[PDB]
PDB file of N, CA, C and O and ligand atoms in Angstrom:
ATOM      1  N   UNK A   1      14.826  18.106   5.849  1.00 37.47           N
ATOM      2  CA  UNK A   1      16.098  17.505   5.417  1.00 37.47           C
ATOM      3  C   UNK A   1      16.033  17.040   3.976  1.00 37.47           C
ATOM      4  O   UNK A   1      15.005  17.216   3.321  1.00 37.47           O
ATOM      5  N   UNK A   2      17.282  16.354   3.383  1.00 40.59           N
ATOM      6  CA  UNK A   2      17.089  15.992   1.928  1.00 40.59           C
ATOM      7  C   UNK A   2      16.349  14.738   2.157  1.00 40.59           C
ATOM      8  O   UNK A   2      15.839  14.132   3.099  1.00 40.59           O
ATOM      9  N   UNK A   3      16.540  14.594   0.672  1.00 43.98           N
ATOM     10  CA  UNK A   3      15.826  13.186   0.614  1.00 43.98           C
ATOM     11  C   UNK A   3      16.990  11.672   0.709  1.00 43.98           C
ATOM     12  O   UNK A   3      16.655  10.494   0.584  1.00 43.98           O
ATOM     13  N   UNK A   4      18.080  12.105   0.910  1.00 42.41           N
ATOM     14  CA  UNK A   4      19.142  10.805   1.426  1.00 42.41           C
ATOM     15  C   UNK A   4      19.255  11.099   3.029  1.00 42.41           C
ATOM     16  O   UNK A   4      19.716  10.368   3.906  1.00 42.41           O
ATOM     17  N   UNK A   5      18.764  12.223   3.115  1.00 41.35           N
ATOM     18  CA  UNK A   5      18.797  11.990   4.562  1.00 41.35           C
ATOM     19  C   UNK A   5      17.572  11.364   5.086  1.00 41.35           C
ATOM     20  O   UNK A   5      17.711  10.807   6.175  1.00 41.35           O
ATOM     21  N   UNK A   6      16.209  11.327   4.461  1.00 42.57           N
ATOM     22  CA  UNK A   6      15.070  11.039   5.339  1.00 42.57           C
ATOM     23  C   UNK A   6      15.397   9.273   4.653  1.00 42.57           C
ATOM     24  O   UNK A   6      15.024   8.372   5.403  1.00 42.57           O
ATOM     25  N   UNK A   7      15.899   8.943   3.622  1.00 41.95           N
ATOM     26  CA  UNK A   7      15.919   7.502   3.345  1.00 41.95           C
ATOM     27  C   UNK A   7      16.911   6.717   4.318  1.00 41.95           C
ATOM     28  O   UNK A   7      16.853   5.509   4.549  1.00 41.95           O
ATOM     29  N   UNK A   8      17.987   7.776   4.936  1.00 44.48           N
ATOM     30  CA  UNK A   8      18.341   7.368   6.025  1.00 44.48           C
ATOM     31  C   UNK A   8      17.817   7.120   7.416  1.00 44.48           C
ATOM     32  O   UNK A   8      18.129   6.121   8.063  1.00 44.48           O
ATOM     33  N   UNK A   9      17.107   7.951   7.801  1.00 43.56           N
ATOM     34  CA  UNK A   9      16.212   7.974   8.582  1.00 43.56           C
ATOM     35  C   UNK A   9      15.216   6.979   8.622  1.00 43.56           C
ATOM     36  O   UNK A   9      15.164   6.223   9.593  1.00 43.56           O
ATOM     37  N   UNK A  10      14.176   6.857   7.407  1.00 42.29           N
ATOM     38  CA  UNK A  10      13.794   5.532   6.827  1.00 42.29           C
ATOM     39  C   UNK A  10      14.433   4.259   7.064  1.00 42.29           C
ATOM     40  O   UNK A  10      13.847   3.282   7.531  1.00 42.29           O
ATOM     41  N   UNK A  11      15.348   4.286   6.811  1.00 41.95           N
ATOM     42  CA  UNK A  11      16.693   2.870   6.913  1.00 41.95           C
ATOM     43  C   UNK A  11      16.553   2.182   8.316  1.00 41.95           C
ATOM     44  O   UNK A  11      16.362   0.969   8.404  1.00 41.95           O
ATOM     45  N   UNK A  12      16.670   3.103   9.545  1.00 43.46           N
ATOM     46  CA  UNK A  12      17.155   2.681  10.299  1.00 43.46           C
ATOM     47  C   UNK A  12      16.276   1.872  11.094  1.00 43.46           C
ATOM     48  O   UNK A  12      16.615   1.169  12.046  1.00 43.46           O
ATOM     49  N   UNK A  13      14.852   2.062  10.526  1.00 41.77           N
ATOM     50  CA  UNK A  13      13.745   1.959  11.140  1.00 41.77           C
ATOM     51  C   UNK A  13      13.009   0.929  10.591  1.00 41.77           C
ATOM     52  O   UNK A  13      12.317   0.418  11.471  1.00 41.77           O
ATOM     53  N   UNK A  14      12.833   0.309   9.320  1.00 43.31           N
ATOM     54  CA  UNK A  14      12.840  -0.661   8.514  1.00 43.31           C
ATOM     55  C   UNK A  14      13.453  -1.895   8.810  1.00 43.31           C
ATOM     56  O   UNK A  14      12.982  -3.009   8.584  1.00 43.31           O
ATOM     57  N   UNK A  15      14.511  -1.626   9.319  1.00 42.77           N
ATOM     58  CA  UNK A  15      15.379  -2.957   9.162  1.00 42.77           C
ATOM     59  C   UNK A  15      15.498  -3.424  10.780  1.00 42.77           C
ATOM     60  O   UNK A  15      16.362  -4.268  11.017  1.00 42.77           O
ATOM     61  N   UNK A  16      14.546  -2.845  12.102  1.00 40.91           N
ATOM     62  CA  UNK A  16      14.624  -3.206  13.234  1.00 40.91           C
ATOM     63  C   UNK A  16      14.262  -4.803  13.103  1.00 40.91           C
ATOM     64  O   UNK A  16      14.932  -5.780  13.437  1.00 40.91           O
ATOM     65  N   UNK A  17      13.004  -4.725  12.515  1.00 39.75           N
ATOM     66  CA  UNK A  17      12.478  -6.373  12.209  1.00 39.75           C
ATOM     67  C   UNK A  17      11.965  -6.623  10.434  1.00 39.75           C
ATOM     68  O   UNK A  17      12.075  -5.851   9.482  1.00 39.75           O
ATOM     69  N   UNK A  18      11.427  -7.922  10.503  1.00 40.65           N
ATOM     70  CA  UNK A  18      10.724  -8.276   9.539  1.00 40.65           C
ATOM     71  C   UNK A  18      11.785  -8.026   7.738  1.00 40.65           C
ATOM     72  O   UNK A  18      12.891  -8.351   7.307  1.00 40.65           O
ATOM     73  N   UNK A  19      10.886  -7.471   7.368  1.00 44.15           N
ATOM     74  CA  UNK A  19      11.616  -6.993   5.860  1.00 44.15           C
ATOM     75  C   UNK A  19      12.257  -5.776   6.761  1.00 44.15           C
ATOM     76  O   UNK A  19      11.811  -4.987   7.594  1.00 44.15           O
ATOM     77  N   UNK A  20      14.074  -6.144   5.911  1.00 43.95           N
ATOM     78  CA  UNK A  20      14.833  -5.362   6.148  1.00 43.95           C
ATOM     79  C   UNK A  20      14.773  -3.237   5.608  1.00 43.95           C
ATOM     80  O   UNK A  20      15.331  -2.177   5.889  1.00 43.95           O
ATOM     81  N   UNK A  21      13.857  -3.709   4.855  1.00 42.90           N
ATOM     82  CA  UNK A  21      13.388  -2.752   3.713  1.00 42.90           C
ATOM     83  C   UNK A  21      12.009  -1.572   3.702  1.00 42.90           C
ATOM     84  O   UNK A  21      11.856  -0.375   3.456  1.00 42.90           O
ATOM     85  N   UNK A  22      11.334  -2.508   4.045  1.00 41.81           N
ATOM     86  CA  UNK A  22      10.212  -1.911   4.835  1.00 41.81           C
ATOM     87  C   UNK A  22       9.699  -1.796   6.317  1.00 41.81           C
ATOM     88  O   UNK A  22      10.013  -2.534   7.250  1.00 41.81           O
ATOM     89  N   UNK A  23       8.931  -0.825   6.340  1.00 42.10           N
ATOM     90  CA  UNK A  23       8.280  -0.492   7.493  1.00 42.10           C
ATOM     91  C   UNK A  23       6.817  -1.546   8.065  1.00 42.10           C
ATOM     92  O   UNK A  23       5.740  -1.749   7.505  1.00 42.10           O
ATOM     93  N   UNK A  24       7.249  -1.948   9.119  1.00 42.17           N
ATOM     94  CA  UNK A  24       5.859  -3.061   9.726  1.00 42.17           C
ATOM     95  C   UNK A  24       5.084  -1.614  10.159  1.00 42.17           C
ATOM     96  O   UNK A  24       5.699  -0.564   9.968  1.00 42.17           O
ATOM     97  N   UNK A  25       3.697  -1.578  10.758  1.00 41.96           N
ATOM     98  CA  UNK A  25       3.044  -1.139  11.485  1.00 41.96           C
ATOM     99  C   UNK A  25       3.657  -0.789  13.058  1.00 41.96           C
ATOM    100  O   UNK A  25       2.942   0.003  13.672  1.00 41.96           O
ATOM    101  N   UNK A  26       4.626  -1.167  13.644  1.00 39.28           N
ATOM    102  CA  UNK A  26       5.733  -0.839  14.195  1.00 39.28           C
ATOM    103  C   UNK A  26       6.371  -0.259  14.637  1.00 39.28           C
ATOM    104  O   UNK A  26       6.343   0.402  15.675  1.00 39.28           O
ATOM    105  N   UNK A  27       7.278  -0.474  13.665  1.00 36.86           N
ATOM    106  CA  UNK A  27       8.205   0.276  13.270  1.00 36.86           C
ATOM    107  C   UNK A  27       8.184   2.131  12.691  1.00 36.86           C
ATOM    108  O   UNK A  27       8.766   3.186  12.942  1.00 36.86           O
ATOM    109  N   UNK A  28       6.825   1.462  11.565  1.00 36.92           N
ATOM    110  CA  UNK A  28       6.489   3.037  11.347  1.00 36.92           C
ATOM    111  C   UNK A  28       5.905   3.807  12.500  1.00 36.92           C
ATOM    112  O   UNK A  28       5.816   5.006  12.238  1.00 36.92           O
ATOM    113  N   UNK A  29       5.446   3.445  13.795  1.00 37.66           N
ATOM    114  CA  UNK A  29       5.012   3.868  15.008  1.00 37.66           C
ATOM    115  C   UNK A  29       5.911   4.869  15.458  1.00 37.66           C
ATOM    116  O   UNK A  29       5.857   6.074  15.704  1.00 37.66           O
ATOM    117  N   UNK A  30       7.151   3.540  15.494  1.00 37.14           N
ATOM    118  CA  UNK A  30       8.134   3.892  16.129  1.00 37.14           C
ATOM    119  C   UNK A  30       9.332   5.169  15.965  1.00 37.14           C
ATOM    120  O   UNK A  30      10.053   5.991  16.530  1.00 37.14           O
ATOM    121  N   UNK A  31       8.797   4.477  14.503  1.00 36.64           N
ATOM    122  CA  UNK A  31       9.953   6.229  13.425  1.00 36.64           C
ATOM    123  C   UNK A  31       8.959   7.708  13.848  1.00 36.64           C
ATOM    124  O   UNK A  31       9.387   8.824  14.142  1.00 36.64           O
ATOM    125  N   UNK A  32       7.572   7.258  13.753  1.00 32.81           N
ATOM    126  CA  UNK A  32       7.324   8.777  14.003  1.00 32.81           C
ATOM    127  C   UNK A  32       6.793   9.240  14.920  1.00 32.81           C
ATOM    128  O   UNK A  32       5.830   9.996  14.796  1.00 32.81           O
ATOM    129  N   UNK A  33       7.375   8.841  16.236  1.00 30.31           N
ATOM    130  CA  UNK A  33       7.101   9.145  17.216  1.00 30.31           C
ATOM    131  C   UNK A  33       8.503   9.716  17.570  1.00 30.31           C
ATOM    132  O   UNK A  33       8.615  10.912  17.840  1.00 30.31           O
ATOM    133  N   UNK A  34       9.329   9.069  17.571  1.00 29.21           N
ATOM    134  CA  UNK A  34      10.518   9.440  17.842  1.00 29.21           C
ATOM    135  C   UNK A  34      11.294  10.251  16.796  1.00 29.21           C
ATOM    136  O   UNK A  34      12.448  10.589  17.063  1.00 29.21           O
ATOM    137  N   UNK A  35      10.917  10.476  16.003  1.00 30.19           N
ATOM    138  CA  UNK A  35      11.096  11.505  14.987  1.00 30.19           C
ATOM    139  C   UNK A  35      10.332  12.863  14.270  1.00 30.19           C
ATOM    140  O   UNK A  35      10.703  13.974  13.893  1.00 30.19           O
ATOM    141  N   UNK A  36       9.039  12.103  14.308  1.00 30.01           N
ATOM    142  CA  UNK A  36       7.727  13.107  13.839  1.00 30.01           C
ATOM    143  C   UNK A  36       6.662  12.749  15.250  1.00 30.01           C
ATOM    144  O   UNK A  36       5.782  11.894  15.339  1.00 30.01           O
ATOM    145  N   UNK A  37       6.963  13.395  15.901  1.00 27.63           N
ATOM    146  CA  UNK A  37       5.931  13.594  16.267  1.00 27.63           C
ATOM    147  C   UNK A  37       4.523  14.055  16.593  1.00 27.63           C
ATOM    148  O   UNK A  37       3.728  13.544  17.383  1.00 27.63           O
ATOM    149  N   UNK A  38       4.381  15.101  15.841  1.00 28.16           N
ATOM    150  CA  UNK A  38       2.881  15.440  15.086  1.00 28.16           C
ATOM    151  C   UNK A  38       2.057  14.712  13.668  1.00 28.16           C
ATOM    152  O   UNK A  38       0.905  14.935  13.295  1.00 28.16           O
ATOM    153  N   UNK A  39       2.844  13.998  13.197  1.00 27.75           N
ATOM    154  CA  UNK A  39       2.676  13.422  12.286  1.00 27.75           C
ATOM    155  C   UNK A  39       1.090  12.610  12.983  1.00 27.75           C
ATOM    156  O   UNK A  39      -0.126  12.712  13.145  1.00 27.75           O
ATOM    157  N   UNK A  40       1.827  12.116  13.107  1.00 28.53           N
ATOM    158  CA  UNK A  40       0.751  10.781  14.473  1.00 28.53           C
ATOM    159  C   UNK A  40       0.204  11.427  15.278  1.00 28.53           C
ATOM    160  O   UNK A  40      -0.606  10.592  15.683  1.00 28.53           O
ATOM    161  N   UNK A  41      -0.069  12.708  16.099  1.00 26.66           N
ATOM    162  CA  UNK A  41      -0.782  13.501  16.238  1.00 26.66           C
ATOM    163  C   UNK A  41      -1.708  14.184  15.618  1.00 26.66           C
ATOM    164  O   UNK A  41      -1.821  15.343  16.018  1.00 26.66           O
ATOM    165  N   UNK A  42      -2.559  13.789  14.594  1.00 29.09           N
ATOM    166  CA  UNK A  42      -3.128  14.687  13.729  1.00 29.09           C
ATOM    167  C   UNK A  42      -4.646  13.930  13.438  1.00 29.09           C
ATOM    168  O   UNK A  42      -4.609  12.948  14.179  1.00 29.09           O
ATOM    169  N   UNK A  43      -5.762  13.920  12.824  1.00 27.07           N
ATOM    170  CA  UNK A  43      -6.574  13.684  12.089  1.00 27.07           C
ATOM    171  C   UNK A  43      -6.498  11.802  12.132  1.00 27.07           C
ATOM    172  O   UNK A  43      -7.317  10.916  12.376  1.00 27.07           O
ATOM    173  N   UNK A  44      -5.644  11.829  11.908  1.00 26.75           N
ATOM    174  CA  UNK A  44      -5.406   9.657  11.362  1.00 26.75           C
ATOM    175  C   UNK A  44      -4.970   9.609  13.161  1.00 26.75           C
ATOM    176  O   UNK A  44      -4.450  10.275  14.056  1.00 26.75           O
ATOM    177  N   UNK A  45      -5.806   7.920  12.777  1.00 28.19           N
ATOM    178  CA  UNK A  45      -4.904   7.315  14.011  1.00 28.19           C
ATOM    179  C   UNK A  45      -3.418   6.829  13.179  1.00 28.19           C
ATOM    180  O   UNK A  45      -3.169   7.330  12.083  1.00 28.19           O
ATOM    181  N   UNK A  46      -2.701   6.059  13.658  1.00 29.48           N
ATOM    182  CA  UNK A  46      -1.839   5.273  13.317  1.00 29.48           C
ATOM    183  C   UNK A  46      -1.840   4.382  12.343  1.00 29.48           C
ATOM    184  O   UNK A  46      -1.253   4.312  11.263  1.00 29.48           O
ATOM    185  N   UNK A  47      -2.825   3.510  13.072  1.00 29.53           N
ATOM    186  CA  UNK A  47      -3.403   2.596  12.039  1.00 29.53           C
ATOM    187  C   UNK A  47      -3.827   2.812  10.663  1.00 29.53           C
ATOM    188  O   UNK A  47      -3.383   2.151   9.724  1.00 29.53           O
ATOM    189  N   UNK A  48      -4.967   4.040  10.514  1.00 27.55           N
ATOM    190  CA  UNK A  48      -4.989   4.563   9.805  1.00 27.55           C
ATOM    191  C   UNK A  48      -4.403   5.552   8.774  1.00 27.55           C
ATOM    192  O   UNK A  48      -4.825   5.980   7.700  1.00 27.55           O
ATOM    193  N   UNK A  49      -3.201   5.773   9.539  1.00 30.17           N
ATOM    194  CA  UNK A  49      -1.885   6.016   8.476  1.00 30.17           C
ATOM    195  C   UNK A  49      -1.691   5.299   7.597  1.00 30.17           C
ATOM    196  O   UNK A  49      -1.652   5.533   6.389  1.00 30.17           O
ATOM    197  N   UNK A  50      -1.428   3.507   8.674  1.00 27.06           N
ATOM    198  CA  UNK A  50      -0.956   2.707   8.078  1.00 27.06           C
ATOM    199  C   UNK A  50      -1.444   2.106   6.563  1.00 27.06           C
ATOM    200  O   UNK A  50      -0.763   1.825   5.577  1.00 27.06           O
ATOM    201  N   UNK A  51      -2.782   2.036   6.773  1.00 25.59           N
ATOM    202  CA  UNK A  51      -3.737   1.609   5.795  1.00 25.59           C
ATOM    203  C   UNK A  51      -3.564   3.003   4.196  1.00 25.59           C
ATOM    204  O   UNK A  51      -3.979   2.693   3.079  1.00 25.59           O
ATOM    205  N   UNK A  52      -3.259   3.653   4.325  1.00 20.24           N
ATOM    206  CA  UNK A  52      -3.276   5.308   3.782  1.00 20.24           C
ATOM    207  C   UNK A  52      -1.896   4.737   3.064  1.00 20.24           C
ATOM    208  O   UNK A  52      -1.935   4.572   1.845  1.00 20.24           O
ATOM    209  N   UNK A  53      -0.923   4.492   3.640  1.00 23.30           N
ATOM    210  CA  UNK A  53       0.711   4.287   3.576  1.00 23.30           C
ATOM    211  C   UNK A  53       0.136   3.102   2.764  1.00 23.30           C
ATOM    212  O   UNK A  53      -0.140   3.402   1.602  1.00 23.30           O
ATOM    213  N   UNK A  54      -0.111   1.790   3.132  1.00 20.51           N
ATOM    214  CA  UNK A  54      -0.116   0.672   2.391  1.00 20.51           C
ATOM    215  C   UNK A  54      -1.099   0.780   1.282  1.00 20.51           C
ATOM    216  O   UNK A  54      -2.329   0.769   1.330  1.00 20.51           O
ATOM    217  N   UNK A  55      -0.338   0.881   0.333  1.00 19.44           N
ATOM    218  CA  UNK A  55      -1.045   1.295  -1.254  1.00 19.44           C
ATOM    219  C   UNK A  55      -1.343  -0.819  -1.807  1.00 19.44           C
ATOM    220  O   UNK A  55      -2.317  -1.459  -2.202  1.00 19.44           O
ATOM    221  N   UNK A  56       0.154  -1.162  -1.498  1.00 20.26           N
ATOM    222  CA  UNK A  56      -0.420  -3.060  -1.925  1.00 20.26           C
ATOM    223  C   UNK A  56      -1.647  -3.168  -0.888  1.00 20.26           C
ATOM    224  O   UNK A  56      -2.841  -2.875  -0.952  1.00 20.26           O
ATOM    225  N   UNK A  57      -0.981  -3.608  -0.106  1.00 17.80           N
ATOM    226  CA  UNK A  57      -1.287  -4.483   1.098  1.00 17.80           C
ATOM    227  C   UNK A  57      -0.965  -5.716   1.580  1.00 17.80           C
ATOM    228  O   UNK A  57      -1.672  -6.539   2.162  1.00 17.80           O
ATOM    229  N   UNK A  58       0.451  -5.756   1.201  1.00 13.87           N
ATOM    230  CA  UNK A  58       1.372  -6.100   1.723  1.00 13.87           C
ATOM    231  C   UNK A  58       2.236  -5.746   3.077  1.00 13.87           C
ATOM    232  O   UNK A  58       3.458  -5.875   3.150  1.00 13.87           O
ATOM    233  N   UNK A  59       1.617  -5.406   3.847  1.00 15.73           N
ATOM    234  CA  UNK A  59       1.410  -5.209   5.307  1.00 15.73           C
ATOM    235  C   UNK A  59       2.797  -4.355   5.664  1.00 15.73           C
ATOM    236  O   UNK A  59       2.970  -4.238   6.877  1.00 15.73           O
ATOM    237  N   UNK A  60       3.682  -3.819   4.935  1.00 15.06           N
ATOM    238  CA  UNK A  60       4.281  -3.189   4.464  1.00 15.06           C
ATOM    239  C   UNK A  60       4.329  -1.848   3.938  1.00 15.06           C
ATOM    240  O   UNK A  60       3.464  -1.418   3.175  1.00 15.06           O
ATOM    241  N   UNK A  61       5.275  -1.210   4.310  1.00 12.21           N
ATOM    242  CA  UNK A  61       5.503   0.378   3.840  1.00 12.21           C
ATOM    243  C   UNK A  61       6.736   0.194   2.891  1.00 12.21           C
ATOM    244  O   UNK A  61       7.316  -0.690   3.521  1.00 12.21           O
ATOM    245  N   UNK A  62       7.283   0.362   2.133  1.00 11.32           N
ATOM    246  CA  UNK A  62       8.421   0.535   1.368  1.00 11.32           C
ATOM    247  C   UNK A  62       8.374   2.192   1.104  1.00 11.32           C
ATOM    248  O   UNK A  62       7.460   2.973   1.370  1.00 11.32           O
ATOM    249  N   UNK A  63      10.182   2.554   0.252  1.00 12.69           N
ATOM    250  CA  UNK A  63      10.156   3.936   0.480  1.00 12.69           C
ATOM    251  C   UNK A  63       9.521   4.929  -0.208  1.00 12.69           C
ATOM    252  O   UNK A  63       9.257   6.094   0.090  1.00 12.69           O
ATOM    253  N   UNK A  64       9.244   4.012  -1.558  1.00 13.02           N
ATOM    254  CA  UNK A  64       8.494   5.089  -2.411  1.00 13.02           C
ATOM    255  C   UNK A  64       7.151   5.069  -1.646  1.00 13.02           C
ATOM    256  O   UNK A  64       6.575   6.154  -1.731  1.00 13.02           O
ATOM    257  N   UNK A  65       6.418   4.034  -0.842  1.00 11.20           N
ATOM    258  CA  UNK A  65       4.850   4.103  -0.550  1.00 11.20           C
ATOM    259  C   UNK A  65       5.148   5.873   0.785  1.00 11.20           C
ATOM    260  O   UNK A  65       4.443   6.881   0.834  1.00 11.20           O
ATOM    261  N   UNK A  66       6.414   5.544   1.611  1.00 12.85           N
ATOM    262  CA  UNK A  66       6.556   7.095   2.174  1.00 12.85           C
ATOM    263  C   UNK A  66       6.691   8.015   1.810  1.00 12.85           C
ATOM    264  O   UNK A  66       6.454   9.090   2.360  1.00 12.85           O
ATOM    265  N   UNK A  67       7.192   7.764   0.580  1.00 11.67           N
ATOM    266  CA  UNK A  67       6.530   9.519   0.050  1.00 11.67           C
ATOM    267  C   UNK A  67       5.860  10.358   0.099  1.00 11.67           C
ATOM    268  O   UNK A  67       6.161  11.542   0.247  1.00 11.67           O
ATOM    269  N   UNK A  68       4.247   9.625  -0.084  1.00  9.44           N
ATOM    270  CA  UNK A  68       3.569  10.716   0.576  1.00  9.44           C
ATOM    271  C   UNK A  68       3.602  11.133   1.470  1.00  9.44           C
ATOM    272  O   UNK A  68       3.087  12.246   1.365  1.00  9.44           O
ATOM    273  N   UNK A  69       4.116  10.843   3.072  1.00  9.95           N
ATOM    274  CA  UNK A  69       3.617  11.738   4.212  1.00  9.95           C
ATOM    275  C   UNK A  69       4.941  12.836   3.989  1.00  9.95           C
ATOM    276  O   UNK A  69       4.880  14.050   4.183  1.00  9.95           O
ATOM    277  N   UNK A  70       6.323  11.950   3.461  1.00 12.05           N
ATOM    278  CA  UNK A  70       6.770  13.504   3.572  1.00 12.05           C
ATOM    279  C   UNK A  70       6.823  15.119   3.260  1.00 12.05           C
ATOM    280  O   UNK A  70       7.413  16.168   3.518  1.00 12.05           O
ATOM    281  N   UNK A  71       5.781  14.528   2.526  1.00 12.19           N
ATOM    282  CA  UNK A  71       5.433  16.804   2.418  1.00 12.19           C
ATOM    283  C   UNK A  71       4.718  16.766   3.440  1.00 12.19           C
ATOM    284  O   UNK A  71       4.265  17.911   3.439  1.00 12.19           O
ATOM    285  N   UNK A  72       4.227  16.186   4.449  1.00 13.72           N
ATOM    286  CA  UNK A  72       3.880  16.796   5.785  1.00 13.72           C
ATOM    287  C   UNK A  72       5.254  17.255   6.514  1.00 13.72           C
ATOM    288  O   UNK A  72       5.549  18.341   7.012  1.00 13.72           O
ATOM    289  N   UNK A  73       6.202  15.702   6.373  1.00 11.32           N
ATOM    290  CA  UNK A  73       7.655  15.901   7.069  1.00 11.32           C
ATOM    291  C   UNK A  73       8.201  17.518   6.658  1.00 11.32           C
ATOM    292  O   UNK A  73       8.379  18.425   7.471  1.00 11.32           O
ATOM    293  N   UNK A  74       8.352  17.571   5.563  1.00 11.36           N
ATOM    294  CA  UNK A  74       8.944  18.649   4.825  1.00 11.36           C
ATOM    295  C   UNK A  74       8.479  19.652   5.374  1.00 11.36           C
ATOM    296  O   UNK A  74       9.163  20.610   5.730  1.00 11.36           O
ATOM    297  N   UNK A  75       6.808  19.516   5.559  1.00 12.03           N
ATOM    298  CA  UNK A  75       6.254  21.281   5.281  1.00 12.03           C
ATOM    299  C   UNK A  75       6.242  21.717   6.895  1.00 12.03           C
ATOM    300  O   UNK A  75       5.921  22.859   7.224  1.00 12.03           O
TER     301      UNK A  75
HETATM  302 CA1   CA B   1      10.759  -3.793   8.664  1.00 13.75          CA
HETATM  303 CA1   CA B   2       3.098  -1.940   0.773  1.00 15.01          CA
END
């Protein structure tokens, strides 16, 4: 999909709890399971996404930190 569509996608999933904006450990579970599901099937646990995803560490995903997995999304 484009990229206003996956920030939509992003959106909806962010703002279940916590920062309206970002992704908890969660939430991002939750988006790609029910959305990607091989994503989280692969090599990483979850967790270890998470840690991969969180570039601060601010316990937090924001949208530019998702960027990277989507050329998995994409490809
Ligand atoms: Ca959130
Ligand atoms: Ca972060």
């Amino acid at each position: 999909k484009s990229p206003e569509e996956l920030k939509g996608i992003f959106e909806k999933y962010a703002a279940k709890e916590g920062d309206p904006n970002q992704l908890s450990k969660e939430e991002l579970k939750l988006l790609l399971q029910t959305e990607f599901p091989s994503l989280l099937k692969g090599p990483s646990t979850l967790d270890e996404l998470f840690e991969e995803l969180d570039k601060n560490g601010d316990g937090e995903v924001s949208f530019e930190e998702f960027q990277v997995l989507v050329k998995k999304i994409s490809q």
